[PDB]
Write an enzyme that holds these catalytic residues in place. Structure first.
Site, PDB file in Angstrom:
ATOM      1  N   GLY A  57      -2.615   4.054  -3.198  1.00 49.88           N
ATOM      2  CA  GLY A  57      -3.859   3.225  -3.674  1.00 49.88           C
ATOM      3  C   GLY A  57      -3.056   1.678  -3.290  1.00 49.88           C
ATOM      4  O   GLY A  57      -1.793   2.074  -2.343  1.00 49.88           O
ATOM      5  N   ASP A  76      11.963  11.387  -5.780  1.00 48.88           N
ATOM      6  CA  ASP A  76      12.062   9.788  -4.749  1.00 48.88           C
ATOM      7  C   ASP A  76      12.680   8.991  -4.606  1.00 48.88           C
ATOM      8  O   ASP A  76      11.569   8.537  -4.546  1.00 48.88           O
ATOM      9  CB  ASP A  76      10.109   9.988  -4.647  1.00 48.88           C
ATOM     10  CG  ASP A  76       9.711   9.498  -3.479  1.00 48.88           C
ATOM     11  OD1 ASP A  76      10.941   9.775  -2.251  1.00 48.88           O
ATOM     12  OD2 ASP A  76       8.940   9.069  -3.519  1.00 48.88           O
ATOM     13  N   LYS A 111       0.711  -0.454   0.399  1.00 52.08           N
ATOM     14  CA  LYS A 111      -0.176  -0.143   0.372  1.00 52.08           C
ATOM     15  C   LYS A 111       0.731   1.671   0.146  1.00 52.08           C
ATOM     16  O   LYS A 111       1.873   1.266   0.717  1.00 52.08           O
ATOM     17  CB  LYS A 111      -0.703   0.113   1.599  1.00 52.08           C
ATOM     18  CG  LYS A 111      -1.629  -1.136   1.285  1.00 52.08           C
ATOM     19  CD  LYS A 111      -2.692  -0.986   2.617  1.00 52.08           C
ATOM     20  CE  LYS A 111      -4.016  -2.682   2.368  1.00 52.08           C
ATOM     21  NZ  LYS A 111      -4.884  -1.928   1.435  1.00 52.08           N
ATOM     22  N   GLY A 112       0.245   2.362  -0.338  1.00 51.11           N
ATOM     23  CA  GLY A 112       1.040   4.008  -0.615  1.00 51.11           C
ATOM     24  C   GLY A 112       0.194   4.459   0.106  1.00 51.11           C
ATOM     25  O   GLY A 112      -1.691   4.202  -0.445  1.00 51.11           O
TER      26      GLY A 112
HETATM   27  C1  QZW Z   1       6.501  -7.464  -6.721  1.00 42.22           C
HETATM   28  C2  QZW Z   1       6.556  -5.600  -6.979  1.00 42.22           C
HETATM   29  N1  QZW Z   1       6.471  -4.943  -6.118  1.00 42.22           N
HETATM   30  C3  QZW Z   1       5.736  -3.479  -6.473  1.00 42.22           C
HETATM   31  O1  QZW Z   1       6.009  -2.707  -5.611  1.00 42.22           O
HETATM   32  C4  QZW Z   1       5.721  -2.470  -4.257  1.00 42.22           C
HETATM   33  C5  QZW Z   1       4.778  -1.237  -3.902  1.00 42.22           C
HETATM   34  C6  QZW Z   1       4.917  -0.268  -3.829  1.00 42.22           C
HETATM   35  C7  QZW Z   1       4.816   0.951  -3.140  1.00 42.22           C
HETATM   36  S1  QZW Z   1       3.328  -0.476  -2.288  1.00 42.22           S
HETATM   37  C8  QZW Z   1       4.187  -1.671  -2.910  1.00 42.22           C
HETATM   38  C9  QZW Z   1       5.945  -3.671  -8.162  1.00 42.22           C
HETATM   39  C10 QZW Z   1       5.911  -2.193  -8.730  1.00 42.22           C
HETATM   40  C11 QZW Z   1       5.889  -1.010  -8.283  1.00 42.22           C
HETATM   41  C12 QZW Z   1       4.827  -0.656  -7.523  1.00 42.22           C
HETATM   42  C13 QZW Z   1       4.261   0.882  -7.051  1.00 42.22           C
HETATM   43  N2  QZW Z   1       4.714   2.103  -8.249  1.00 42.22           N
HETATM   44  C14 QZW Z   1       5.583   1.149  -9.237  1.00 42.22           C
HETATM   45  N3  QZW Z   1       5.764   1.802 -10.816  1.00 42.22           N
HETATM   46  C15 QZW Z   1       5.600   0.182 -10.100  1.00 42.22           C
HETATM   47  C16 QZW Z   1       5.998  -2.876  -9.878  1.00 42.22           C
HETATM   48  N4  QZW Z   1       6.506  -4.352 -10.432  1.00 42.22           N
HETATM   49  C17 QZW Z   1       6.769  -4.631  -8.482  1.00 42.22           C
HETATM   50  N5  QZW Z   1       6.890  -5.629  -8.100  1.00 42.22           N
HETATM   51 CL    CL Z   2       7.690  13.508  -3.697  1.00 39.93          CL
END
Ligand code: QZW
Ligand code: CL
EC number: 2.7.11.23
Length: 331
Positions: free
Chosen positions: A25, A141, A21-22
């Site tokens: 979303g 970031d 989660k972020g």
């Molecule tokens: C396993 C995995 N995790 C990811 O994000 C982890 C995450 C980040 C914030 S909340 C959870 C990703 C993502 C990802 C996640 C967030 N933004 C972008 N542009 C790509 C792509 N492929 C992934 N495979």
């Molecule tokens: Cl930022």
């Protein structure tokens, strides 16, 4: 939004589980029945603000996609995007865990100078790709959490999350970057360029090797004070042009600058990077004493590269192509 495991979308994706989660979303693991592979779906909240930055993220990733070159492959691959139940959904390749998790797995004692070098080389190559004139993308970031291993067994990485990103000359926010990785020019309220990512990178590489953040300010004042402990008072020509110089510093009778002092930091430029790295004392906390690829000579090259990455002047700060030619990367 409730996304159950086993939920089927559009006769194409089966939702398996929550990855994380972020503020944007959530990211879910899902099976793509068409390509027959697992993907990560980034599900944007149904709120104007989050939709608007995800739309910029999609534009910047699609812009990168049309530049087929050897250097685009340190950036996570956007496969496509769609609108579903008023959520913008971005479909990516699956990657693995992030570099902060890698550090937590070392009990924050840090990875080897050799693995730090492999990360540095991939990230310098990513930043060289973002600097392509027709892209000129600032990530805004960069931090361990936004760098993912491609594979839990391996040392390949990719940058994720272009949710704060902008092209050069498309700046929106003055307050950007995660505080620990925030460049002096952003702390000082100055117009920023792709050099803020190189500042973040220098901070990240020191942290990946020592296990701890280089500059862990609890707020912007503490952040600038921790940077000054290591690198000294920023140059006058910079402070002279800085809208927020007087948030941290004071100009003196003869137009020299000093810290504004608060209630009771090492004096300016005396928390030496050579001691943080342990160049001549067996690496961070002496824990590398006598390991191969951790000689004083290897350490001096690393230190030299980091101090070029942490130039106060974004005009003279090392750029990605020149960072890749540094002796630190030479066999
Ligand atoms: C396993 C995995 N995790 C990811 O994000 C982890 C995450 C980040 C914030 S909340 C959870 C990703 C993502 C990802 C996640 C967030 N933004 C972008 N542009 C790509 C792509 N492929 C992934 N495979
Ligand atoms: Cl930022």
């Amino acid at each position: 939004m409730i996304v159950k495991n086993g939920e089927k979308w559009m006769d194409r994706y089966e939702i398996d589980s929550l990855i994380g989660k972020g503020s944007f979303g959530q990211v879910v693991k899902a099976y793509d029945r068409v390509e027959q592979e697992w993907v990560a779906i980034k599900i944007i909240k149904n709120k104007k603000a989050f939709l608007n930055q995800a739309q910029i993220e999609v534009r910047l990733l699609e812009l990168m996609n049309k530049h087929d070159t050897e250097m685009k492959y340190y950036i996570v691959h956007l496969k496509r995007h769609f609108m579903f139940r008023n959520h913008l959904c971005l479909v990516f390749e699956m990657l693995s865990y992030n570099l902060y998790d890698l550090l937590r797995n070392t009990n924050f004692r840090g990875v080897s100078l050799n693995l730090t070098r492999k990360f540095a080389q991939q990230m310098c190559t990513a930043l060289l790709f973002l600097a392509t004139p027709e892209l000129s993308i600032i990530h805004c970031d960069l931090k361990p959490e936004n760098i993912l291993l491609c594979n839990p067994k391996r040392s390949a990485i990719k940058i994720v999350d272009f949710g704060s990103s902008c092209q050069l000359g498309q700046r929106i926010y003055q307050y950007i970057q995660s505080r620990f990785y925030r460049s002096p020019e952003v702390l000082l309220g100055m117009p920023y360029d792709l050099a803020i990512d190189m500042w973040s990178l220098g901070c990240i590489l020191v942290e990946m090797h020592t296990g701890e953040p280089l500059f862990s300010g609890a707020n912007e004042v503490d952040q600038m004070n921790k940077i000054v402990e290591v690198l000294g008072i920023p140059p006058a020509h910079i402070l002279d042009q800085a809208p927020k110089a007087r948030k941290f510093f004071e100009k003196l009778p003869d137009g020299t600058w000093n810290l504004k002092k608060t209630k009771d930091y090492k004096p300016p430029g005396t928390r030496k990077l050579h001691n943080i790295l342990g160049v001549e004392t067996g690496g961070p906390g002496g824990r590398r004493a006598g390991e191969s690829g951790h000689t004083v000579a290897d350490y001096l090259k690393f230190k030299d590269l980091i101090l070029r990455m942490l130039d106060y002047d974004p005009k003279t700060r090392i750029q990605p192509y020149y960072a890749l030619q540094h002796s630190f990367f030479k066999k």
